[PDB]
Amino acid sequence: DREMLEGYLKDRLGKVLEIYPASVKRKEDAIFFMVKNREDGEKYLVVIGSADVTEEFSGDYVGEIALEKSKAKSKVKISERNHNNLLVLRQYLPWLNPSVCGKRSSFGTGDRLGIATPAHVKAFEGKECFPFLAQQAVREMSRTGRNARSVLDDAIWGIFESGYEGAFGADVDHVKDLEDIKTAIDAGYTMFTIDPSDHVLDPSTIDKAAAEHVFFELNERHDFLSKYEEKVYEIGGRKYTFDRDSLIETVITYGKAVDHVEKCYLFLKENNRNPFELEVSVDETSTPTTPLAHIFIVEELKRRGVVFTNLALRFVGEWQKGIDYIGDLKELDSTLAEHAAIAEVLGPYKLSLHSGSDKFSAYPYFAKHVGNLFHVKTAGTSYLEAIRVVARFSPELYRRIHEFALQRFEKDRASYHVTTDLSKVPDISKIPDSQLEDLLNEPNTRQVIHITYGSVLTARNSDGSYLFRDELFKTLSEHEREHYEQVASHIRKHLDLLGV
Template sequence: MKKIIEILRENNLEELSQTQLDRLKASEREKIEKDSTRLYTRSLYTREGILYFVAKEDGEKSLYLCSHRVLPEDFTGQVEQFGDLFLKKAPFSTDNAATLRTVFPFTAPVSLREKRTTIGCGDRLGIASAAHIRAIRKYQAYPVLAQQSIRELNFTNRTFKRIVADAGFQVFQEGYEDGWGADGDHLKSIEDVDTALQAGMPMITLDLTETLHPEAVRWDEPKIEEEFGELPQAVRKHIDQEYRDLVFENRGVTVRLPRLEARRCALMYLDALDFAALMDRHIREHRGEAYDLEISIDETSTATLPGHHLFIIRELRRRGVTVNSLAPRFIGEFQKGVDYIGNLEEFEGQFAVHCAIAQAHGDYKISIHSGSDKFSVYPAIGRYTHHRLHLKTAGTSWVEAIRTIARTEPELYRRMHKKAQDFFPEALKSYHISADISGLPDINTLRDSQLEEYLDISESRQMLHISYGGLLRDSEIRGPFFKALSDHEELHETIIRKHMEKHLSKLGVKKR
């Protein structure tokens, strides 16, 4: 820790007031370096005679506390004394993250229900949030930095507490005090929701897949009438009275829900909507009103028809569910890590209807799942939502991290590429994509300078995108991969920041 003390004394940091530190943080000087040791200037805060900051020493980031008096034991870590200064190195542990939240509440995630534009960042590695913050703080948008599904946690050997901690430390590193979210993504059970709530996650994305009855979409009229007749009389009466040839009109949009289709919707969705109401009450009991519930109906094999969207939101409102955002399945293909696949005019026409429905029923956010890299449809999404939206990204930052490897560590990239090819059949069991990797260029024939081209070919980009589980659990890859990203931290953050800025710009989000 000697180099860190030298940085502090050479810059007189331990003697500066918070006002003086804020002037330094507002400058273009993002870090102070001495040899291989780096102090992140935006993390400089003083509280009750203690200077707090994030620094990187020997390739490892930690939280540091410095004072002229003996340091409190709230934070666990190693303490050394240098003359009249005490310095504590507190590792980025979940316990230290919890303590940090008590001292600096802005490092805790909050509800973003009142924020117009929110971006799910999905940092699978736990080291990209700083770059996400640097991009988003330039725009009139707010980040959901800690966003992971149970599937992602299993593939990366992380926990909800870990991802909240990782994001919180980077929030502190960047001195970001505008508010950020944390999302337990695609949760299907009360047990998983409780795990996310216990980790302090204010946003829950409730995946209704397992309580839906999608088979009803294929039933003919006699089958629908037969199954509908098995529902309780009170339910049948409500559906027939409430949806008797319903016509919805708003912003020049007309949606009709005929009697037969309303009955089909009842058979498809009512169980799922009852489950959503149960979960909404459960979350409210734990968090009061400080939560963001997203309803996900996008994990289906067919697009969500506007009439079905109308039925779903009317029934959710009838049940008193507080809907912050809703994710329909849109027409066309929203596959992982690549642009929209489908007819743009057809998408725009149907998307406008979904937005009109949302705006007339509480103006909840339309949520775009698998939303990264869909640059061709972003202008329409921004226009029709008036930027009241939630965009979910996740794997794109993982893929762009691999771009850093392709540029700087070609041999490591080659090993990752070959292992991704081997793991690809297994990865396909968890993700639906249409990539055919059989026609990819043979990596053995490419020069090192050509490797980055794989990140711009849809098939190889998708292959790498969904193979993260196999790669990150591979002992031959994991250590060298994270070391390379640490060694090339500035390039990694620049690539991620620019990629996220491209998303915000294409959506038409205004700059601050």
């Protein structure tokens, strides 16, 4: 029984170590599982088996035990979740490795904290949907002190705690330059979201002379007019015609970005021996992606040999972080029908919705038009659920965090376009500890907390110690069950409304 192993461990190491039953796996002669120290919340891997297997793991030996199956004694060793031990574990447990998704529906669950992957796994139970359990943008990793190795390692450690053996993917989100691509390659990420948004031009903000010079140079090098001028596409009972000026606007908007994407794809082809997937994100545009722009981007990618699986368009309406969709559902439905039809005939390929966190108003139309071949990305919503749990069990922490975030909001709201109304966040000094949790139901407070995640995590006192991160993680460890169920139920709501 589990309690006998726990007593063995308590007697020899002198700590109360509780076993996660679902983590226990038996392969080779060996038995692997994860324990948690009741005193400090530290989690450890325990390996029981032949000396030849325990020797490949670093850590201190606990002793010898007798397996029920065989007379010969087995070595018991306890190891920390360092990187090389996770590598050895991932060789003994081959499912602990990211896979390429392919042309099937998927869902990304970013984890800005590194501890929510078991909950994300709970959310996919029974769902027919490929999970991206490792997903963090380069900028998120920068703002949190994590790197691609550590993000993937956190996700895989959580998967091991959960006991999940199905497939999963690892997405390096919004990548711009080639060195970050190299780090994600060396870590073994399986999806690369190429973000060429630096090169995207908005013709409504630049002068006409500059737009002209840009088109002239791009067309002198690529001959876009001979390729596309007057060309007609029949897709979905509709006609699309590349007239001169539409093609010119499209080229000035997207040509240099397509060049950037080509360069990144060629880099991945040269430096990645492992199976990989490529998503092309144009989710950073002030204007919704027109259908003609969609056609041009996809046709240029196909002409250049850039093999992509996902295309993340910028849809009509308002896609702000932490709140629901604001837009004309009529036009969203119609444009989604348009883009889905073009995706079918051009590829087919996956349409990828970034900023999907909490857009429940729009998920019906999404499941209608792309419900077969979609990808939906989320990240900050799990952080919001964690902060909700913090306000539920450590209100004095949430109060200080709320004030600090309100003061940091001005510097932090620059990198995002949020129409937050600060006068509509409730006055926290008039709210007792017993009710702070309700604050995370109010959209503008949700935006303030979503946006300032990095500042709260990185905040440091004068002496050099962090103000919140230590207590934040200790709080979340003390109420792991509640954190898990809140995150899992939220993500599963997202999956339910998407029809999977």
